[PDB]
Design a protein around this ligand. Structure first.
Ligand SMILES: *[C@@H]1O[C@H](CO[C@@H]2O[C@@H](C)[C@@H](O)[C@@H](O)[C@@H]2O)[C@@H](O)[C@H](O)[C@H]1NC(C)=O
Ligand SMILES: [K+]
Lengths: 215, 217
């Protein structure tokens, strides 16, 4: 199980920029049995480069590969939006074949403020004895964001589930969902629920509120 | 067209075993080795072993030679992997893939999501997310998918969503139950005028949900 170390682990590139990523093996591996794969979130890997430098069917010509011995590289002459993905190297010089830890290549783009939307518990959920308040924070960049929940002015930290999408295929922004879940009894003891986002695009939080007396 | 079709997601209890399948079509099954690989969430790929359906010979990662047994059925052009004495760390997506020239992996199955856990298979509750009674040219709606186990769930929308207007968030586990959400942003002239529906499938429990996003009254 020959160790393959990929560097960098994470990197970003603007459109049109040259990108090179490397894979270093702990032992020498024949260039005929060195391959690269691309994987996008939620999908199977795709053969990208075979035997060091041959492009698989359908792979854009802006990609190339090179190397021998222990040092291999995948180069992208011009970063494009559809190239944001994780790339893995693979050696089959010996059994067992092994794969790299991956280089996650991201797309740099212009800053975008989150568009914030808040939703009260559905009448349907309220019959279950639970109550969730949901906040979407959509189409922002960069990924760095902080979300706070306030219940009648006091911060709530317990019962909050946050999840982030990876970069949108089209505009390359991130989105985030924040779900506050309480018991129905606890939910009905308060008036207003506020989700507050802090992001570099605004010195003020971007916020939305829902109050129970308005609905 | 070459296709590798894997069996569905499954939940298995600690200490039991799992057998999953990889159905090959569109080429001569017996002429190509099939590899089986493991991928944990947020990790790279780990090779388990291969099956040569020509001579029924399988080769194993030494790590897996006790736990894994790879077989094939020439009668149905199907390769199988059995994993025995399972524990929580066997939870992963498993791929079958075809060995091509110089042992590159050209065609891949869609993956089988295996969860090993003491928890119970539970179908999702799906809840509509509609704005509170308090509009812009665009309106965001959503659905909240709660209380299910195991992964995965799929969400598809019937809507007038705009460019980069659909976001389905990776599920988060809490206390043996998953929460997932999905948002859709549509022009405000399309809703509540035209019907918007969140369609959720949970293959592990053999359930679906077709939830209409109704405005709050
Ligand atoms: C594999 O290599 C890792 C990185 O070490 C560096 O690169 C290798 C190829 C050598 O040139 C070494 O002198 C370098 O410092 C190691 O961190 C790792 O321990 C190695 N793994 C094993 C199992 O030996
Ligand atoms: K319905």
């Amino acid at each position: 199980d020959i160790v393959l170390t990929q560097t960098p682990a994470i990197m970003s590139a603007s459109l049109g920029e040259r990108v090179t990523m490397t894979c270093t093996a702990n032992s020498s591996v024949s260039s005929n049995y060195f391959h690269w794969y691309q994987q996008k979130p939620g999908s199977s890997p795709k053969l990208w480069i075979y035997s060091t430098s041959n492009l698989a069917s359908g792979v854009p010509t802006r990609f190339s590969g090179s190397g021998s011995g222990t040092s291999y590289s995948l180069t992208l002459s011009s970063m494009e939006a559809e190239d944001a993905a994780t790339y893995y190297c693979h050696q089959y010089h010996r059994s067992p074949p092994t794969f790299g830890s991956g280089t996650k290549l991201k797309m740099k783009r212009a800053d975008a403020a989150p568009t914030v939307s808040i939703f009260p518990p559905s009448s349907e959920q309220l019959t279950s004895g639970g109550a969730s308040v949901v906040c979407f924070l959509n189409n922002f960049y960069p990924k760095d964001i902080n979300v706070k929940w306030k219940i009648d002015g006091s911060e709530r930290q317990n019962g909050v589930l946050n999840s982030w999408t990876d970069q949108d295929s089209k505009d390359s922004t991130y989105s985030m969902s924040s779900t506050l879940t309480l018991t129905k009894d606890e939910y009905e003891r308060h008036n207003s629920y506020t989700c507050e986002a802090t992001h570099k695009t605004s010195t003020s939080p971007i916020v939305k509120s829902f109050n129970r007396n308005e609905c | 067209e070459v296709k590798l079709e894997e069996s569905g997601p499954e939940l298995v209890k600690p200490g039991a075993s799992m057998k999953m399948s990889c159905k090959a079509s569109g080429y001569t099954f017996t002429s190509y080795i099939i590899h089986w690989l493991k991928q944990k969430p947020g990790q790279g790929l780990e090779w388990i072993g291969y099956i040569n359906p020509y001579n029924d010979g399988s080769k194993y990662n030494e790590k897996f030679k006790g736990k894994a047994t790879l077989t094939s059925d020439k009668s149905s052009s199907t390769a199988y992997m059995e994993l025995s004495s399972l524990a929580s760390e066997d939870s992963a997506v498993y791929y079958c893939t075809r060995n091509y020239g110089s042992d590159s992996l050209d065609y891949w199955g869609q993956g089988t999501t295996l969860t090993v856990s003491s928890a119970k298979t539970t179908p999702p509750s799906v809840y509509p997310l509609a704005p509170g009674s308090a509009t812009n040219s665009m309106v965001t709606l959503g659905c909240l998918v709660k209380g299910y186990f195991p992964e995965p769930v799929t969400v598809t929308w019937n809507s007038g969503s705009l460019s980069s207007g659909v976001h389905t968030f990776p599920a988060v586990l809490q206390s043996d139950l998953y929460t997932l959400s999905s948002s859709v942003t549509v022009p405000s002239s399309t809703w509540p005028s035209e019907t918007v529906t969140c369609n959720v499938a949970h293959p592990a429990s053999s359930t679906k949900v077709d939830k209409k996003i109704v405005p709050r009254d």
